[PDB]
Amino acid sequence: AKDPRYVGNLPKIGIRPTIDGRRKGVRESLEETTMNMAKAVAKLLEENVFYYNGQPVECVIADTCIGGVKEAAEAAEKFAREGVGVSITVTPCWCYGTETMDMDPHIPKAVWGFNGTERPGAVYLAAVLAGYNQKGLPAFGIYGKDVQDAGDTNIPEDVKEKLIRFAKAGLAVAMMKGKSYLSIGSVSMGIAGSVVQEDFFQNYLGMRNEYVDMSEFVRRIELGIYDKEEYERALKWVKENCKVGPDNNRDGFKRTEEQKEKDWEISVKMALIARDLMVGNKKLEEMGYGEEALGRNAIVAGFQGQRQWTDYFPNGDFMETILNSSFDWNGKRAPYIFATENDNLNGISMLFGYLLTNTAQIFADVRTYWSPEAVKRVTGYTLEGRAANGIIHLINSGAAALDGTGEQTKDGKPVIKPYYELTDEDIKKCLEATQFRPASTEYFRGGGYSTDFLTKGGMPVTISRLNIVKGLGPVLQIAEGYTVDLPEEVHDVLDKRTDPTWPTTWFVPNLTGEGAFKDVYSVMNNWGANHCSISYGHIGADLITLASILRIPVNMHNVPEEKIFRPDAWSMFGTKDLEGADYRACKKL
Amino acid sequence: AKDPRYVGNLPKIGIRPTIDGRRKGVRESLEETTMNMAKAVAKLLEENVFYYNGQPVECVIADTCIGGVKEAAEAAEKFAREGVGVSITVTPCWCYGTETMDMDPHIPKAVWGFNGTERPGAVYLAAVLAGYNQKGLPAFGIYGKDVQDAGDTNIPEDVKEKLIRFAKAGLAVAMMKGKSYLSIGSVSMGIAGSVVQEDFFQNYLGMRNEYVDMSEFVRRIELGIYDKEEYERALKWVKENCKVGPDNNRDGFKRTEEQKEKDWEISVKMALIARDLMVGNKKLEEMGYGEEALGRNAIVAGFQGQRQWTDYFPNGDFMETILNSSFDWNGKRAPYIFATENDNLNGISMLFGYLLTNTAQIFADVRTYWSPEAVKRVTGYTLEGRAANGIIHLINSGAAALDGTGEQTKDGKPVIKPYYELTDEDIKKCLEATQFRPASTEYFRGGGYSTDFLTKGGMPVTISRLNIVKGLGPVLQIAEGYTVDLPEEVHDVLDKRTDPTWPTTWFVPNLTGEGAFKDVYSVMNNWGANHCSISYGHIGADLITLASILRIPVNMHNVPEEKIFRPDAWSMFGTKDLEGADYRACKKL
Amino acid sequence: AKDPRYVGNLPKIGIRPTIDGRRKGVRESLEETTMNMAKAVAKLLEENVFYYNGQPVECVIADTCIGGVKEAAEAAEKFAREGVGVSITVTPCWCYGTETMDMDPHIPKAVWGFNGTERPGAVYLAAVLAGYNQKGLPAFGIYGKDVQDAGDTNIPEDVKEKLIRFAKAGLAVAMMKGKSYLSIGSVSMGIAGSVVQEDFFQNYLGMRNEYVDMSEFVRRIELGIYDKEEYERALKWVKENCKVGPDNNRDGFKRTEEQKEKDWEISVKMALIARDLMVGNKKLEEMGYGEEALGRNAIVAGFQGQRQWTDYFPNGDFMETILNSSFDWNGKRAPYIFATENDNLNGISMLFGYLLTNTAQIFADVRTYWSPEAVKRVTGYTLEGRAANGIIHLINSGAAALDGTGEQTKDGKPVIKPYYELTDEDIKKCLEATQFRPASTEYFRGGGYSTDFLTKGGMPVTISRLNIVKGLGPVLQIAEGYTVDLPEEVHDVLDKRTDPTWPTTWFVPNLTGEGAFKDVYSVMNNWGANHCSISYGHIGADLITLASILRIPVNMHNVPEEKIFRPDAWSMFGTKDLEGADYRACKKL
Ligand SMILES: C[C@H](O)[C@@H](O)[C@@H](O)[C@H](O)CO
Ligand SMILES: C[C@H](O)[C@@H](O)[C@@H](O)[C@H](O)CO
Ligand SMILES: C[C@H](O)[C@@H](O)[C@@H](O)[C@H](O)CO
Ligand SMILES: [Mn+2]
Ligand SMILES: [Mn+2]
Ligand SMILES: [Mn+2]
Ligand SMILES: [Mn+2]
Ligand SMILES: [Mn+2]
Ligand SMILES: [Mn+2]
């Protein structure tokens, strides 16, 4: 399947069914059972793993069962020729280890050994993995807990969860390769994550780094380098669906009516240009702007904003909010992972979750830790339920995907769905629960409109953050938890004394009474940056798998140990202290 | 004592009696007491540690007490000429640290400080260990928990354990240096462990690497290069004591009667040739084959087998079974550590446990994990006792020491004893409980005879595996547990649908509730290879101490932490997380 | 084009035409010129570089000029689907560095900047090379010394050389990836190079490692697993074209007539079996041996031989001689790089030169250094010409491609040509100048037929050796020189007292007066092994470029420094001492 936005095709998953090489007996008796095992997996993935556009992941099965090096090489040729980016080996019998290995060091690989009695399937699993570990080519091992009878094409639940987790993590990793990260502007207000370390993108993600100064937005707005037809349509949509809230700037800080109208115009143009830069726009060709039409093939981008741009032009709250949303004037669509303040690292954090879920991600500041004592002192209210031990106030400085309202609903519960599952009502409710407020000119002299909403509580979420530490490299921290609802009057009091014109999410992380999850305070005290990424659902186990593939250790997370799924090689670096083994395995391999 | 099979003598343990060099009163009053400690330690060791031939380990005590560098040099000189390969320092008083140190880097060393009040014995212990830690020379520290009165030569129980544990691990380590690993054939069916990494053998174990193509067996069989008189006796012994069980090959795969008889002949010859290769055979010289007579001075070897050899000739089951056993047509004898499928890493795994116990080791595949739910479905029987949480099927592809029956007895319990403790009954019953079945031709086209037995339950055992992981090097995993008995009818069903003509051992590992031992399944899912070595008894602690001496980290083990005995410097790398400290200490030291 | 012997297709060279992205005038005026450079480079390469089957290398040009990341991604996508394994960027103007870079790390890349004045072509060259050096992606830089007028498509001579040199080295490198090294037998007589270090094959060459015990030859010979119809033709061809020379074994060591005939039969079968193992044989499938039919997809292999096999069966001289030759009973054909004594390192040495020239390589021992004083004493003859400073006796223990005679001719000069350029006369004379002598039974008890010839003098050659040194890894040594002729009677004396039944080549290396080349003796005293590979022509420079691409340092070579062509980053590690820089660059990059 052609990637609808980026060069080339979407990564495919290749299934390698291995078999015993002995003919005139053994091989013939397993030819059908082994091939059927591969088809079952293909069918499973096709029904559970989907590309960011809603299409089912496409699988490629080897033309024959691999029993030796010849057939293994023919498979590689076929997979490489068909654009396979993830490989899964399946078998019910004994196979000749290294002779049947996938030797491509550049793709995520997993091996599923059938837990049957008739043949040494589990023996090949441990044998080939011993090979993988010994050669230094990480591989995941999949082995079901319960014995199944020969030929059982019904994949057991424990096996399913691993195949899917592996597939999604692998697909996400394969999706980033070859793509660009567009840096619009430079470092923002000294924020570490806004500095671009190419080594990370190139070596860890196989991505490219593109750069463009914000003055480009001036040129494109002045010369009208954008779809003017689309612009008018978007300007009209904004006036029909975006409700303007009260202006909080006090006299001396209030922009005029005329200023506020130009603020909406530029903001809209900014959204169009940022998107045109990221994925290009063929409309620009007939307009005489062929080079601009091309785009930067960026699957993720960032906009510096403060201080240089915002001190004169409207801020990027709307642009940053709309791009990340799952809909706009052109209807429902996939989000455009856009990082506020050019925090490229937070952009990647968001990208990880996006590629693992196909759903909008919320950029946000870890602003305040509210202790049960403080909420009581200030509002007189005693936190209850999930909030009984304190809460964390997540609120970006003005921009956040409209999906963050939590108005999207499934089975009566608040969620964030992939754009392709959205209903007309989901969209309308998100928009109605949002209020655009004039930017606080004391911070943003140029003007703009911030996204003001309150995330519905009770929704399971996962916040995460990728950081780069000298002497260690990239490292990931994860925190699964839920969003909470406070009584209306309590929210108002906490909100008014912070920044009521910005988007709000009340977060409670799942505690474990250990590490940095002993209490709510520790979760925040250990956060390694001012920013984090919020994703609907509990994708922590997924993030852990993905990180291990990328060779990025996880310094902090509250995922139950039984869900941790990493390449077989990790266990050789330690089994009593997984965190320790994670660091040792990442560095060495 | 002279090593009966290999070049040179058996390693000796040297005792160094350190003392306060100060005369005028101090030393004159401590020589007798110090020497008495040395004498006490030698007596203790000679009664508890034995070479693989049953002979008690021989100790050497310094000619004088050691209170300075001159006397220390004198000791080194004597030990070197006396062939010492392990040293133990003893003292009841203060001595001058580095001036009294054993500076040999290639010799396992321990220091025992008397826990007496009169003199600073414990003060010397800590002072000199700090020295060994500063100089980078690992040394074990032994301190008794209960204060003893000056002169008491009764070695406390907690001190005895460590002294013996150190002595055994050290002896095992010293036993391997200079010996060869004979590789017969090359890589077998792509099994990672059949690849020979000379670096490991030379640098960790100080062993030599010898190689010989299996075609050598053809030459010797065709040209009758072997003791023809022994061959006859051997053939006659096999016929009188080896019962041939039912042939499971289905008509289209059955070998004629003529072939089956030839299979026996060649199988017996294979045994003789393999053994002649490992330790030579003076008989060959008389026959005119002087080069062949010499042998490869190998204390451990392996035989490729599949696919090349077994595709035409009788497999090596009988050869691999008889060599590893503690007896044959020539009566009871030490075993010959022999690796199936030329898996040298499992060969070393077996050699480890063999040098620590003097008993036959069982080579086997980690074939199937049987959950209680699975056994209930397949048999309708509910697992009880140690089996209630699940069992692991350990069964090599056809070969296993006859000791593996568990028919040997001590105090009415099943055990595997050192060959020198065997009674004629023990031997007789091991053979009785065993059936030699015609090899499965679909797998082994050239015929042969696999070993079929069922290890008796209730026997304490320890399974282990050495693996080599890229970016880490050698790493060991241990799992202590027990063999179990299953209802006769329950066993038959489970056995018939697996591989009934191969040796079976039902294994249940001890669980800790944490790490790789939260449940039976986890133990198998964390095994880093398809093979393992089974040793009678619980020798995890001994293995851990041995591995620490070899600087080989232990990624997985269920040995109670209180039993962990490692060089003093290990704790300098951490006390809260021994696993992490093990890796740090192994790497830096 | 499809690779005739191995899985998949032959590597293609991709051309990337980079341009200034600026429209409005610049780019519109440079597309034609840029594309023309690409076309010129493709035409040049197709006329000068050829696959090992004589077919001209196939090039692929980007669909559009490359002025940004989008077009660059487009190029990557196309090249990947077109099976490109080597890339060359071309341009006559300035382009945007990193935006136009080829980011594939696993593909040899070069950049050619036009030396024109109109545009900043040379400025792009240096700018993008700096980029490749900063990102750690080696890339060759090609700059012409003479300014050319805009539009000139005539590629200057100095640029042609580098383009072709890069193309050939890159092709050779791309040719090995995915291919297997077949190891038949194990270590031979303790020769370091017969030990297989998978790490090298997998990480430096991207090759697979296959293994098969020599006992396989017994099975196939006994069970007639080979083309019986070809065998007959082969036996008949040997009798009509292979002359049997005098038997040098002295009565007590002569083999009967029956044995000598069997020796021929088995020798011919050995050749067929070895070849069937390397590339399979569809004929085997028809015969019912489908697994055997597949082959091991090996582009290079080795045969242990001594001691195990030769102690009973006919040695592999004929097999090793015929396989490496450019012709046999089936006519002229590409050679089969085959290593004597399973010395895989010499196999790779030969494979290197073979992939750079498409010609048979000569396997040989560096047997004796003959000083002028020594030859004067033993023969009374004074060495003249190139031999005046001494000669080195290169003579393998019995095997050598018949091409080694030097009987092939071009312009009245002795040479070794690619099989596709051979005339019937060439072949006829190679056989005529060769004598097959009965193997020396004192060394090879099982019989056989060694190859006896005398390479003609005056032929330019290059000998080379790849070694693996602990603490360094792979390291290559080169020595260009010439073969020489000695008076007929002088040769006989020197030959008779060495080994007259083995192939002889009198070698004289070029001296530089410095390093390992101050004198003939120094060249041999600095050879790091007993073996070497002899290739026709002076290919040191080509080898150096190939080694730099493989990141394998060259410890010794007599190639004029002006001819050294390495990735641009190499000079960043030093310009005054290229040897030191080579090591620093190989290690860090
Ligand atoms: C207005 C402020 O600069 C605000 O944007 C910052 O505090 C930002 O939230 C830092 O992450
Ligand atoms: C018959 C089979 O090849 C069997 O020997 C293998 O599966 C072996 O158990 C691998 O460890
Ligand atoms: C006959 C000898 O073994 C000969 O083959 C060896 O010396 C060989 O040349 C070693 O390279
Ligand atoms: Mn912020
Ligand atoms: Mn609000
Ligand atoms: Mn096995
Ligand atoms: Mn049985
Ligand atoms: Mn040689
Ligand atoms: Mn000659």
mmCIF file with all atom_site columns, C-alpha atoms in Angstrom, chain A residues 87-152:
data_model
loop_
_atom_site.group_PDB
_atom_site.id
_atom_site.type_symbol
_atom_site.label_atom_id
_atom_site.label_alt_id
_atom_site.label_comp_id
_atom_site.label_asym_id
_atom_site.label_entity_id
_atom_site.label_seq_id
_atom_site.pdbx_PDB_ins_code
_atom_site.Cartn_x
_atom_site.Cartn_y
_atom_site.Cartn_z
_atom_site.occupancy
_atom_site.B_iso_or_equiv
_atom_site.pdbx_formal_charge
_atom_site.auth_seq_id
_atom_site.auth_comp_id
_atom_site.auth_asym_id
_atom_site.auth_atom_id
_atom_site.pdbx_PDB_model_num
ATOM 1  C CA . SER A 1 87  ? 9.821  -10.122 10.223 1.00 0.00 ? 87  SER A CA 1
ATOM 2  C CA . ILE A 1 88  ? 8.201  -12.957 12.173 1.00 0.00 ? 88  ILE A CA 1
ATOM 3  C CA . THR A 1 89  ? 9.379  -16.565 12.048 1.00 0.00 ? 89  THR A CA 1
ATOM 4  C CA . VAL A 1 90  ? 6.929  -19.362 12.832 1.00 0.00 ? 90  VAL A CA 1
ATOM 5  C CA . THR A 1 91  ? 7.452  -23.097 13.139 1.00 0.00 ? 91  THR A CA 1
ATOM 6  C CA . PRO A 1 92  ? 6.053  -26.221 14.775 1.00 0.00 ? 92  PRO A CA 1
ATOM 7  C CA . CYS A 1 93  ? 9.165  -28.376 14.410 1.00 0.00 ? 93  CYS A CA 1
ATOM 8  C CA . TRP A 1 94  ? 12.952 -28.398 14.730 1.00 0.00 ? 94  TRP A CA 1
ATOM 9  C CA . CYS A 1 95  ? 14.862 -26.296 12.179 1.00 0.00 ? 95  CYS A CA 1
ATOM 10 C CA . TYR A 1 96  ? 18.605 -25.883 11.560 1.00 0.00 ? 96  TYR A CA 1
ATOM 11 C CA . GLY A 1 97  ? 19.248 -22.733 13.587 1.00 0.00 ? 97  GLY A CA 1
ATOM 12 C CA . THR A 1 98  ? 21.631 -20.327 11.867 1.00 0.00 ? 98  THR A CA 1
ATOM 13 C CA . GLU A 1 99  ? 20.848 -21.991 8.509  1.00 0.00 ? 99  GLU A CA 1
ATOM 14 C CA . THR A 1 100 ? 17.312 -20.550 8.716  1.00 0.00 ? 100 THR A CA 1
ATOM 15 C CA . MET A 1 101 ? 17.945 -17.231 10.460 1.00 0.00 ? 101 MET A CA 1
ATOM 16 C CA . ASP A 1 102 ? 16.779 -13.887 9.169  1.00 0.00 ? 102 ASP A CA 1
ATOM 17 C CA . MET A 1 103 ? 20.184 -12.188 9.021  1.00 0.00 ? 103 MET A CA 1
ATOM 18 C CA . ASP A 1 104 ? 18.924 -8.698  8.263  1.00 0.00 ? 104 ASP A CA 1
ATOM 19 C CA . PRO A 1 105 ? 20.184 -6.631  11.222 1.00 0.00 ? 105 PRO A CA 1
ATOM 20 C CA . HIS A 1 106 ? 18.038 -3.667  10.179 1.00 0.00 ? 106 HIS A CA 1
ATOM 21 C CA . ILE A 1 107 ? 14.542 -4.962  10.931 1.00 0.00 ? 107 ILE A CA 1
ATOM 22 C CA . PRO A 1 108 ? 12.583 -5.938  14.052 1.00 0.00 ? 108 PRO A CA 1
ATOM 23 C CA . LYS A 1 109 ? 12.321 -9.732  14.203 1.00 0.00 ? 109 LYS A CA 1
ATOM 24 C CA . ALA A 1 110 ? 10.356 -12.209 16.325 1.00 0.00 ? 110 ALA A CA 1
ATOM 25 C CA . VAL A 1 111 ? 10.171 -15.998 16.464 1.00 0.00 ? 111 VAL A CA 1
ATOM 26 C CA . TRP A 1 112 ? 7.018  -17.918 17.369 1.00 0.00 ? 112 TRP A CA 1
ATOM 27 C CA . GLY A 1 113 ? 7.561  -21.510 18.403 1.00 0.00 ? 113 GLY A CA 1
ATOM 28 C CA . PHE A 1 114 ? 4.458  -23.692 18.511 1.00 0.00 ? 114 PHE A CA 1
ATOM 29 C CA . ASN A 1 115 ? 3.992  -25.348 21.879 1.00 0.00 ? 115 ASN A CA 1
ATOM 30 C CA . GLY A 1 116 ? 3.291  -28.812 20.510 1.00 0.00 ? 116 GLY A CA 1
ATOM 31 C CA . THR A 1 117 ? 4.501  -32.226 21.628 1.00 0.00 ? 117 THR A CA 1
ATOM 32 C CA . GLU A 1 118 ? 5.032  -34.077 18.328 1.00 0.00 ? 118 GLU A CA 1
ATOM 33 C CA . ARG A 1 119 ? 8.019  -31.966 17.156 1.00 0.00 ? 119 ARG A CA 1
ATOM 34 C CA . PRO A 1 120 ? 10.784 -29.839 18.799 1.00 0.00 ? 120 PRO A CA 1
ATOM 35 C CA . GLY A 1 121 ? 9.233  -26.467 17.936 1.00 0.00 ? 121 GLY A CA 1
ATOM 36 C CA . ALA A 1 122 ? 10.094 -24.924 21.310 1.00 0.00 ? 122 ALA A CA 1
ATOM 37 C CA . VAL A 1 123 ? 13.580 -26.392 20.905 1.00 0.00 ? 123 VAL A CA 1
ATOM 38 C CA . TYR A 1 124 ? 14.138 -24.404 17.690 1.00 0.00 ? 124 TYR A CA 1
ATOM 39 C CA . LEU A 1 125 ? 12.781 -21.300 19.403 1.00 0.00 ? 125 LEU A CA 1
ATOM 40 C CA . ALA A 1 126 ? 15.479 -21.472 22.108 1.00 0.00 ? 126 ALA A CA 1
ATOM 41 C CA . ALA A 1 127 ? 18.104 -22.668 19.628 1.00 0.00 ? 127 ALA A CA 1
ATOM 42 C CA . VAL A 1 128 ? 17.685 -19.882 17.066 1.00 0.00 ? 128 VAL A CA 1
ATOM 43 C CA . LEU A 1 129 ? 17.352 -17.271 19.805 1.00 0.00 ? 129 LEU A CA 1
ATOM 44 C CA . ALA A 1 130 ? 20.608 -18.543 21.298 1.00 0.00 ? 130 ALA A CA 1
ATOM 45 C CA . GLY A 1 131 ? 21.921 -17.907 17.814 1.00 0.00 ? 131 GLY A CA 1
ATOM 46 C CA . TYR A 1 132 ? 20.446 -14.404 17.651 1.00 0.00 ? 132 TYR A CA 1
ATOM 47 C CA . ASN A 1 133 ? 21.843 -13.483 21.061 1.00 0.00 ? 133 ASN A CA 1
ATOM 48 C CA . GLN A 1 134 ? 25.247 -14.903 20.115 1.00 0.00 ? 134 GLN A CA 1
ATOM 49 C CA . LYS A 1 135 ? 25.428 -12.979 16.832 1.00 0.00 ? 135 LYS A CA 1
ATOM 50 C CA . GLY A 1 136 ? 24.070 -9.819  18.401 1.00 0.00 ? 136 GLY A CA 1
ATOM 51 C CA . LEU A 1 137 ? 20.889 -9.631  16.329 1.00 0.00 ? 137 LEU A CA 1
ATOM 52 C CA . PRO A 1 138 ? 18.035 -9.029  18.821 1.00 0.00 ? 138 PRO A CA 1
ATOM 53 C CA . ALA A 1 139 ? 14.890 -11.104 18.379 1.00 0.00 ? 139 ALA A CA 1
ATOM 54 C CA . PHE A 1 140 ? 11.693 -11.561 20.339 1.00 0.00 ? 140 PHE A CA 1
ATOM 55 C CA . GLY A 1 141 ? 10.713 -15.024 21.510 1.00 0.00 ? 141 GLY A CA 1
ATOM 56 C CA . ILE A 1 142 ? 7.084  -16.115 21.546 1.00 0.00 ? 142 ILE A CA 1
ATOM 57 C CA . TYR A 1 143 ? 6.106  -19.286 23.401 1.00 0.00 ? 143 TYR A CA 1
ATOM 58 C CA . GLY A 1 144 ? 2.585  -20.142 24.596 1.00 0.00 ? 144 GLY A CA 1
ATOM 59 C CA . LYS A 1 145 ? 2.042  -21.434 28.137 1.00 0.00 ? 145 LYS A CA 1
ATOM 60 C CA . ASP A 1 146 ? -0.439 -24.193 27.198 1.00 0.00 ? 146 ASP A CA 1
ATOM 61 C CA . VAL A 1 147 ? 0.218  -27.149 24.882 1.00 0.00 ? 147 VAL A CA 1
ATOM 62 C CA . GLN A 1 148 ? -1.918 -27.213 21.728 1.00 0.00 ? 148 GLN A CA 1
ATOM 63 C CA . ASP A 1 149 ? -2.492 -30.216 19.469 1.00 0.00 ? 149 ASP A CA 1
ATOM 64 C CA . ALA A 1 150 ? -0.666 -30.513 16.152 1.00 0.00 ? 150 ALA A CA 1
ATOM 65 C CA . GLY A 1 151 ? -2.018 -28.155 13.490 1.00 0.00 ? 151 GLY A CA 1
ATOM 66 C CA . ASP A 1 152 ? -4.153 -26.034 15.816 1.00 0.00 ? 152 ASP A CA 1
#
